[PDB]
């Protein structure tokens, strides 16, 4: 291509317009086109590339649909606020998991995910191994006990890697980033 | 009476009887006469003599042993030891959700190290944050071709290789002219990075966080430390 001005005097279908959309890169095109696409690998590839062009705050949208989810969790721990992530780890708690609460975990100090976690586990084991801090290992000996114990040995963990970064006042987050064409 | 016979049977015959003692029931007596590695070593998962079954593994010679002696040693609850067996199977994934679970950076230095083995890019750096460490999880990204998402992280929580990352995305960019493609500015214009002011940088919060890193944030806990993470968080953080 040389503009996509040239798209404007003749182009086609959405189908056609899409070809466009990739091929001038139009994604002017492309947004209708995106929306009116759902090729899914279509879009799938496309708003990374969108954001690759620019702006996440579409770009949030598109890879909603598209079950990024983690990904977008993702753009939320890395930014420096609190809750979006912690919606999202309800709604993907909630459709299951047995490898995945450590996702809500870290960047967080306390987690509820230990009220499920126990069921998953239940041996009062992982129950305390968490537990212990909040100053509350002792529910988790409480049922280990019940149960008749079965704990006898452990290896080194005792928490000591660093959960801390993020943010404090002055040089950002970005929730929203600006650029320029320039 | 059998003893008597005992002496009078070798190699081969002990295993088939072995079976039949096994279908008696009589495990441990089964374990007595073992005779194949195999033979010992299945019966030694239903037997558990932990530590003497480490011993008939000696040098197991096989990690897949270790990968089901290692279920089996986790439910005994021998973690010292399964922690030993796992790390000697290195066999990671399993073995970090014990480690994560009461925690550990110096599991953190070894796997950071198995973390560079792994071959996808993600887990490495949960780590790396997990850690905390930009500059692992930013150091990682330059392999990758993570980009973007790498301005992401450089923003964020700054180490202000946005300014140096970005020059190196913008130049891909770049590479991929076009104005619009190209993309321009740190300090002022486009951007005015030191000069909007705002979030990810500076001193004094950073001192006092300088120790903060150094303590265990409180609350009530045990001898495994406290960090915390939550809305106090929020608030000193800004101040």
Same mark, same amino acid.
């Given at each position: 291509?040389?503009?996509?001005?040239?798209?404007?005097?003749?182009?086609?279908?959405?189908?056609?317009?899409?070809?466009?959309?990739?091929?001038?890169?139009?994604?002017?095109?492309?947004?209708?086109?995106?929306?009116?696409?759902?090729?899914?690998?279509?879009? %799938?590839?496309?708003?990374?590339?969108?954001?690759?062009?620019?702006?996440?705050?579409?770009?949030?949208?598109?890879?909603?649909?598209?079950?990024?989810?983690?990904?977008?969790?993702?753009?939320?721990?890395?930014?420096?606020?609190? %809750?979006?992530?912690?919606?999202?780890?309800?709604?993907?708690?909630?459709?299951?998991?047995?490898?995945?609460?450590?996702?809500?975990?870290?960047?967080?100090?306390?987690?509820?995910?230990?009220?499920?976690?126990?069921?998953?586990?239940?041996?009062?084991?992982?129950?305390?191994?968490?537990?212990?801090?909040?100053?509350?290992?002792?529910?988790?000996?409480?049922?280990?006990?019940?149960?008749?114990?079965?704990?006898?040995?452990?290896?080194?963990?005792?928490?000591?890697?660093?959960?801390?970064?993020?943010?404090?006042?002055?040089?950002?987050?970005?929730?929203?980033?600006?650029?320029?064409?320039? | 009476?059998?003893?008597?016979?005992?002496?009078?049977?070798?190699?081969?015959?002990?295993?088939?009887?072995?079976?039949?003692?096994?279908?008696?029931?009589?495990?441990?007596?089964?374990?007595?006469?073992?005779?194949?590695?195999?033979?010992?070593?299945?019966?030694?998962?239903?037997?558990?003599?932990?530590?003497?079954?480490?011993?008939?593994?000696?040098?197991?010679?096989?990690?897949?042993?270790?990968?089901?002696?290692?279920?089996?040693?986790?439910?005994?609850?021998?973690?010292?030891?399964?922690?030993?067996?796992?790390?000697?199977?290195?066999?990671?994934?399993?073995?970090?959700?014990?480690?994560?679970?009461?925690?550990?950076?110096?599991?953190?230095?070894?796997?950071?190290?198995?973390?560079?083995?792994?071959?996808?890019?993600?887990?490495?750096?949960?780590?790396?944050?997990?850690?905390?460490?930009?500059?692992?999880?930013?150091?990682?990204?330059?392999?990758?071709?993570?980009?973007?998402?790498? =301005?992401?992280?450089?923003?964020?929580?700054?180490?202000?290789?946005?300014?140096?990352?970005?020059?190196?995305?913008?130049?891909?960019?770049?590479?991929?002219?076009?104005?619009?493609?190209?993309?321009?500015?740190?300090?002022?214009?486009?951007?005015?990075?030191?000069?909007?002011?705002?979030?990810?940088?500076?001193?004094?919060?950073?001192?006092?966080?300088?120790?903060?890193?150094?303590?265990? =944030?409180?609350?009530?806990?045990?001898?495994?430390?406290?960090?915390?993470?939550?809305?106090?968080?929020? =608030?000193?953080?800004?101040?």
């Amino acid at each position: 291509k040389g503009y996509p001005e040239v798209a404007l005097h003749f182009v086609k279908d959405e189908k056609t317009r899409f070809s466009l959309a990739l091929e001038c890169g139009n994604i002017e095109i492309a947004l209708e086109a995106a929306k009116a696409l759902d090729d899914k690998n279509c879009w %799938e590839k496309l708003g990374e590339v969108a954001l690759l062009q620019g702006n996440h705050q579409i770009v949030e949208m598109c890879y909603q649909r598209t079950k990024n989810f983690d990904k977008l969790s993702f753009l939320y721990l890395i930014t420096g606020n609190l %809750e979006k992530l912690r919606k999202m780890m309800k709604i993907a708690e909630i459709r299951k998991d047995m490898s995945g609460h450590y996702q809500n975990a870290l960047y967080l100090g306390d987690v509820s995910e230990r009220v499920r976690i126990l069921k998953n586990c239940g041996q009062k084991s992982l129950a305390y191994l968490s537990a212990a801090t909040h100053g509350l290992d002792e529910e988790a000996e409480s049922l280990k006990e019940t149960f008749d114990p079965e704990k006898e040995t452990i290896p080194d963990i005792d928490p000591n890697a660093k959960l801390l970064q993020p943010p404090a006042p002055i040089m950002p987050l970005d929730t929203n980033w600006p650029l320029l064409t320039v | 009476m059998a003893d008597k016979v005992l002496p009078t049977i070798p190699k081969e015959q002990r295993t088939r009887v072995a079976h039949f003692l096994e279908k008696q029931g009589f495990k441990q007596q089964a374990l007595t006469v073992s005779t194949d590695p195999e033979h010992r070593f299945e019966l030694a998962l239903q037997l558990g003599e932990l530590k003497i079954a480490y011993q008939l593994a000696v040098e197991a010679e096989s990690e897949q042993k270790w990968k089901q002696l290692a279920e089996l040693a986790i439910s005994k609850c021998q973690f010292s030891l399964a922690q030993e067996c796992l790390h000697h199977a290195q066999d990671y994934g399993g073995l970090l959700l014990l480690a994560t679970a009461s925690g550990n950076a110096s599991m953190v230095n070894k796997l950071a190290e198995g973390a560079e083995r792994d071959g996808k890019n993600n887990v490495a750096f949960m780590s790396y944050f997990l850690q905390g460490k930009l500059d692992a999880c930013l150091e990682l990204l330059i392999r990758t071709g993570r980009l973007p998402e790498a =301005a992401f992280l450089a923003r964020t929580y700054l180490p202000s290789q946005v300014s140096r990352v970005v020059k190196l995305w913008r130049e891909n960019l770049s590479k991929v002219n076009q104005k619009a493609a190209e993309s321009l500015a740190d300090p002022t214009e486009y951007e005015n990075l030191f000069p909007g002011l705002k979030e990810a940088f500076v001193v004094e919060e950073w001192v006092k966080e300088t120790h903060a890193d150094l303590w265990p =944030a409180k609350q009530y806990p045990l001898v495994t430390p406290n960090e915390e993470r939550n809305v106090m968080e929020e =608030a000193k953080g800004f101040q």
